[PDB]
Design a protein around this ligand. Structure first.
Ligand SMILES: Nc1ncnc2c1ncn2[C@@H]1O[C@H](CSCC[C@H](N)C(=O)O)[C@@H](O)[C@H]1O
Lengths: 265, 265
């Protein structure tokens, strides 16, 4: 009669919370989805071994078209877990699943875990200064999504930072790199010419948040566009004007050039 | 010979990540602060039992004024951990402590934990639609801060949601309720008359996120201002224009008036 939405956290199998792991271990059935994102620092086998029970992975279609026929039936007479990368319901499509549970007469509870949305605090940027967020998707065919450019523009003009989630082709395990995102943004700049993203734009890259050794780097696009930030996942942030403490953290912890202290503050 | 910043999570001792727990268990010295937020579902004793270590609690002054004198000295010869409610670097100024650690020749690492900043996803509001965040501070003496009002105005005018962290005075055990926040905002509205926060404004309240049964309520200020949302901590959210799916979740899960379903496109 109960369905638990359990977050797996940021990077590896130990990023789940103690609460999430203990609840999952007591569930009769464990399902999971790995399409809103992936857990780059681990494998399905390692997560399965930690929990101690077999995990039934659902595809995007399984969830969107058949969640109520795959997961909910068992949740009616058993305790069922539905694992998701990060924090449940940060991904926009998760929320509606709680309504489906209600419709099926199934109780649902959410077990939170770290999300990249909040983990960016490790960049040293003040969380309150983050404005609207956006995702940079891989162009495909004649589709070159670029609304994120206006998101950066609108946030920056109000002195706010912009968090850019980078695309991940989950089934192919293809992660968009900060380099690829910067290249796309420069192309969009060529088309819009709003002076929003250029070689002189200060950006912050966070790779493998959750790891004990994530890569945290800050600097100008001209210098970072071809830099190796290591294995995935990557996110990119275009900060707005900086508080001196934010800049000092970027310089001392993220290796930002001293120039940001007199250009971006 | 290192320092670990470890988040404890939203509500109780089990909100710590498995990664954080296993690292804390092996540290030689453990410090913590409980003034940045309130973990309503646990006690210092329960946390100490889980980690199997004695925890030295520090005050705001101990940290902001003497962190490098109380904590770093030990971190130079042993593995030390500094625990905090929620995520250690969200809506705190603890990131700056990593700069102090570096200057003292101490390597530091960060272990994330679920944060209220991302937990708001449980309200059904799209995370990417949240704009700048603000804090509703307690008026004191002859002062009455109102900056948070302008944050709501700025976000709302561009269709973004506003997350309002509520004040806390741990030493005096004062935790601002969503009710008090609403009362304060109505008083600011009477002064600025910007039509930003009135009796007809739709708001969302999230209380005790992280617990299995948090209070999630949505409705007009006039109806919720005197409603009992349970024990603290609370957070207040003033949504911008809603997407139909956001409204549906607020109605089905947060008990919002069905009239909000009729979104004014
Ligand atoms: N579990 C919880 N439920 C509701 N509000 C919470 C909360 N935890 C924190 N808050 C809100 O956030 C304020 C503390 S701000 C510090 C936040 C913390 N670093 C984190 O990552 O969550 C509180 O005064 C309250 O308004």
């Amino acid at each position: 009669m109960v369905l638990y939405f359990i977050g797996l956290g940021l990077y590896d199998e130990r990023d789940i919370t103690v609460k999430g792991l203990e609840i999952a271990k007591k569930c009769d059935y464990v399902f999971a989805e790995f399409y809103t994102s992936l857990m780059a620092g681990t494998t399905l086998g390692r997560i399965q071994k930690l929990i101690g029970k077999e995990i039934r992975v659902l595809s995007r279609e399984d969830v969107e078209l058949n969640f109520e026929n795959i997961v909910l039936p068992l949740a009616k007479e058993n305790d069922v877990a539905f694992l998701t990368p990060g924090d449940p319901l940060v991904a926009t499509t998760h929320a509606e699943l709680r309504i489906r549970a209600k419709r099926a007469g199934v109780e649902s509870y959410v077990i939170h875990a770290p999300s990249i949305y909040s983990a960016v605090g490790i960049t040293g940027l003040h969380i309150y200064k983050f404005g609207k967020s956006a995702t940079v998707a891989y162009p495909e065919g004649n589709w070159f999504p670029r609304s994120y450019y206006d998101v950066i523009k609108e946030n920056a003009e109000r002195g706010l930072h912009t968090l850019l989630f980078l695309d991940i082709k989950a089934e192919k395990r293809m992660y968009m790199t900060a380099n690829e995102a910067m290249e796309l943004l420069l192309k969009v700049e060529d088309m819009k010419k709003g002076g929003v993203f250029t070689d002189d734009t200060l950006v912050v890259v966070l790779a493998r948040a959750g790891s004990l050794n994530p890569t945290i780097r800050a600097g100008y696009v001209k210098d970072l566009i071809r830099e190796d930030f290591g294995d995935p996942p990557h996110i990119l942030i275009v900060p707005g004007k900086l508080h001196i403490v934010e800049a000092e953290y970027l310089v001392e912890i993220a290796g930002a050039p001293r120039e940001i202290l007199r250009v971006n503050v």
